[PDB]
Ligand binder design. Structure first.
Ligand SMILES: N[C@@H](CC(=O)O)C(=O)O
Length: 390
């Protein structure tokens, strides 16, 4: 009767229904879309309110600096490690061998924005413009500025501080209201996915699917589990038990941004103080996408093998860096990781025709990479809290 089991029951029964009815399972697809829309509804107001309240409640900008620096460095390190693992596993298994489809028809798309332009785009020219377009990074930057101001403004900031502190709680309550619909939404999503993706579609790229899932599992049990058990002295089996809801929601939804409310809600029961969680989770939700980096590395290697091109060491490292940047730039919307794969492939010069190969089964890989992305945020929160005085 506990909410998590209800979500689990919905998940399992949706899988069963999709297996039974197959293609016909799309009929129930709209029900899942309602759940996704409801989850998306909460993100932006929740993100802004939580960031502002967390920074304001901390009341120490100097403390904020340490947390931000450590979180950013950890995100970068985990992302590079994830892409490295992806490359290693892709080389070991060679998913793209025994396959060659389509010509190298035409040159790829040039003129992607430079590194400098993306950094300049993180500051909004109009905060309401950022809010309206749902640009997460701009909203987060403005919220950080607002929180610092409130933390330093002092007595005169009490009205704004209290208003946003209450607004964050209101958004959490709204999230709790939505979760009553979570099991049915997950059921519908699983039914749709399983029914749509029949055995025939997966078998041609079964080795690619296995490589991606194995990479995600290896990341979870080697990077996160170690950083919990060896460094933070946290029993990983209890950690994942407490996190389970967020992992399952991310797996079913394939949307880190839409999963953020569940992640934030779960983080409060994790034990980390709310001040660090509020700042870190929104940032990692769009900056920390280690699962995306691993998936992008694996897909790039698969595409390279699909057309006989074997990369030199320099090319593989360029994949490391470009995949890190792409994961940084990827948004938390399903299918985003595949779209950004153009930025990675173009760097090495691999044909973009390979994307057509992945575009079919993409959702099955999106599930795993989104699960890893969501888990990474909570693991980072726990580690940062442990590094400070938890
Ligand atoms: N769907 C993933 C992004 C990706 O496609 O890699 C997410 O929202 O976290």
């Amino acid at each position: 009767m506990s909410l998590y089991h209800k979500i689990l029951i919905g998940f399992v029964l949706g899988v069963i229904v999709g297996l039974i009815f197959g293609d016909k399972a799309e009929f129930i697809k709209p029900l899942g879309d309602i759940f996704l829309r409801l989850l998306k509804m909460i993100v932006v107001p929740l993100v802004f309110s939580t960031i502002v309240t967390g920074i304001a409640s901390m009341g120490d900008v100097k403390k904020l600096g340490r947390i931000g620096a450590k979180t950013l460095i950890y995100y970068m390190i985990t992302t590079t490690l994830a892409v490295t693992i992806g490359l290693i596993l892709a080389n070991i298994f060679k998913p793209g061998k025994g396959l060659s489809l389509g010509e190298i028809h035409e040159v790829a798309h040039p003129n992607a924005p430079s590194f400098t332009e993306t950094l300049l785009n993180m500051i909004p020219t109009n905060p309401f413009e950022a809010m309206a377009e749902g640009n997460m990074l701009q909203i987060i930057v403005f919220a950080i500025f607002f929180g610092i101001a409130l933390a330093l403004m002092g007595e005169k900031a009490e009205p704004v501080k209290k208003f946003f502190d209450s607004a964050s709680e209101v958004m959490f309550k709204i999230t709790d209201i939505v979760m009553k619909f979570a099991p049915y939404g997950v059921f519908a999503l699983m039914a749709w996915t399983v029914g749509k993706y029949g055995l025939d579609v997966l078998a041609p790229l079964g080795k690619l699917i296995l490589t991606v899932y194995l990479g995600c599992i290896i990341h979870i049990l080697i990077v996160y589990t170690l950083l919990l058990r060896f460094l933070c002295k946290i029993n990983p089996l209890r950690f994942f038990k407490k996190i389970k809801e967020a992992m399952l929601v991310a797996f079913s939804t394939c949307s880190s941004a839409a999963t953020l409310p569940v992640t934030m809600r779960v983080a409060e029961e994790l034990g980390v103080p709310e001040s660090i969680a509020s700042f870190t989770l929104p940032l990692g939700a769009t900056i920390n996408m280690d699962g995306t980096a691993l998936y992008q590395g694996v897909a790039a290697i698969f595409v390279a093998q699909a057309y006989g091109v074997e990369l030199t060491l320099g090319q593989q490292l360029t994949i490391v860096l470009t995949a890190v940047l792409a994961s940084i730039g990827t948004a938390g919307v399903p299918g985003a990781g595949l779209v950004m794969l153009t930025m990675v492939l173009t760097s090495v010069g691999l044909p973009l025709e390979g994307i057509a190969l992945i575009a079919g089964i993409d959702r099955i890989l999106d599930m795993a990479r989104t699960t890893v992305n969501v888990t990474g945020d909570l693991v980072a929160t726990a580690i940062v809290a442990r590094t400070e005085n938890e």
